[PDB]
Amino acid sequence: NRPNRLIVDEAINEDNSVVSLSQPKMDELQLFRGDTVLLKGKKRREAVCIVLSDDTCSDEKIRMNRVVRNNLRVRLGDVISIQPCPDVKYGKRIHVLPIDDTVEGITGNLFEVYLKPYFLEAYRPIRKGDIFLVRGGMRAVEFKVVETDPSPYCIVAPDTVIHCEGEPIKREDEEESLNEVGYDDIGGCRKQLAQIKEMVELPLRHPALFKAIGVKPPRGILLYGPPGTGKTLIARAVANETGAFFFLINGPEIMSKLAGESESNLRKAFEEAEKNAPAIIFIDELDAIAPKREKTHGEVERRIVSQLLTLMDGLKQRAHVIVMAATNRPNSIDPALRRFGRFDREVDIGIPDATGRLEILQIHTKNMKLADDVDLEQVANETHGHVGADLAALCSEAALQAIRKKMDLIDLEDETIDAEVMNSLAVTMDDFRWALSQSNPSALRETVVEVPQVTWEDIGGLEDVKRELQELVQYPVEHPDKFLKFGMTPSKGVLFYGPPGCGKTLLAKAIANECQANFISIKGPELLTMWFGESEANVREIFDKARQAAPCVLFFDELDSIAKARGGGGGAADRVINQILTEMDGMSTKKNVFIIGATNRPDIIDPAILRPGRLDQLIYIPLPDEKSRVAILKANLRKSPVAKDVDLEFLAKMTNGFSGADLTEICQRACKLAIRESIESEIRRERERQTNPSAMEVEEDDPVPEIRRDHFEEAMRFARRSVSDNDIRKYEMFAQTLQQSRGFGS
């Protein structure tokens, strides 16, 4: 019962000689955050590192980098003893040698480019026989600390002369390489990688214990997503990091053979993974082998599908084999493969969000050298609809434009192998600014599931509606116990209705931002574009995406288009509304999926939507008042530089009966007047400066930097109301008599 045996978890820090610990474990273990610890591992191999602190780190777990993890012959979830050692002295001679595979391109220097900035103000604790890694110069490079004269371990001081001359040596056959793929090469998919580790790590770490329990493990894991999102990468990383045997079956490579060779290749893969248990068999591109029953023709294709089903069912009589697979959508797989005892667990890898895209861009720009203006958060906010492969291509294209301009400088003697041109080489912001425009993203039709970025501050007015939406959406998530006590059940749906342009889409986004839930937006034209024989699996697919990503807000915008397409034979409108109604009835509230609709025409809505148990909360969103108009105009003008002279309350008194869209239109029109005036002034000053050279005052400056009362008072003369007064009386009537539409009605 010792407090020094610890177990490895994933690393957050980026350094090669830093381990992390939580503070109570250090205080029990008598360690401070400047110490120099010694770490023992399997096959009697040990390491030396600098410890620091963390709060996200637990006590039963230590977080260390992959380079330390591979110098200890340790994988994820293994045992390591830590002990303090202030017995570390400085050095005199330290002999390093590169490793033969990483040094086949460059020749010339290795000391000043690589080793010189690495040990400067670092004092990295090294030991004899350790491999370390340096990034820089569009390449990563390995070295091994071969010999220390104060043997065996020391701290690299400026006293130590570092021998970097000799032959790059060969590897030992059990040295784990650093060009392999691990968990740090994957970004933007934290949750899914956690699920796959939970499913897979225990039945492959502990086969004997888990056989001795008597529980069944999973055996079929189907990864799916759009093309190019890193599924082959995830399977390869789980295989390398658990250390299991790994056999790869490729889809076209099996279907390209002749007949009896295809059957025997499948059978040999499953037998060979019997022999070397534990294993992982990865079937890449499954829908080339086993597509739909109606899309196969012949004897050979159906015979291969039946072969694969026999082997998947016969895995039960085997020991410790996981079968993974990958496909671009689940609906094209033969549905007999997704039963029980076959591919029964599904993991969905989607397109990344903004945090994900920044993390991809940081992965691919490791070995490159960036210029000092390049801010990758702006690139990550610009690139929308990019999967990971597109971001890798964008980084590669920017690097090639930089090397092309340096061949515009240096072309004559650049043909030799120089390290200096690589030293000077840098990628500016305009290269990324170029390659952003000449890039063709590939996931724009895909439905986006993310948290929105519209807070409550973008919305002006509407103060009781916000309270009512909190009490509908947020309260049965945070406080389920009150609803258990008082004996009621929460409701499921809301319908917003009202005049055009008053802020319904913004409210539906802001409550999803408030509750930190996902958000799926569907518009009426998107449902009507879905075809005659195609709308069915599509509406079911949207309600499935809502169940997988719960707690969710599923928002049906623009219902008046679906209503107007009925009656001019409008059969597709009736088919879509009936199928939405059936899916709402089937939905059980124990996943916290919450449904919202919105309409500008509350007179032609289908009354069966308003039934209790369906969208039966009716919130009327009206034209704003004078205080509300002041709040709207303040909300739209937060980014614009506005002069002090502007009176907003005067604009609110002058604009009566406007909606929110018209107030935004007035702001847009005034800003265009400002840009026109500025460009006239720049043409006039350029003309005058060029027509009178040698001017005594070279004073470049903003002539008008802000928006004054002239611009708003001119933009006010072109204002037009969007909602006429007869319409206002009709919306006031429906505000009270909408709920009576279900009987005979009107």
Next chain:
Amino acid sequence: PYFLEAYRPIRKGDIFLVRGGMRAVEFKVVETDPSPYCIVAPDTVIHCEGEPIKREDEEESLNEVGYDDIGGCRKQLAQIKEMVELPLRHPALFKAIGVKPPRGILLYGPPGTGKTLIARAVANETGAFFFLING
């Protein structure tokens, strides 16, 4: 915990079964000194040391499937017993009657509701020969 406040009447040569610990376990009462049958009192010292022995080839195992592994389908299992139990219990008598039995029984339902299980249980519990063809 098994024999505590139980006083279970045992006999020499019987197999019994204990559940617990994410596993079921078998034992056989091999030898009683008041031969052959007795009641397990706190007087009895219970020898639980030795080698776990092999089975006899006609010992019916308890990892097989019977009618107690099926739940939630009382009515249908009653129908299948009525159709099947008499023509397989008494073949000679039923041939001597002159009535035809059924010969094709189609079980159907959604995926995952235990159809393979029901057929396997009827096969084990009647003791008929059983051949499995897989599609």
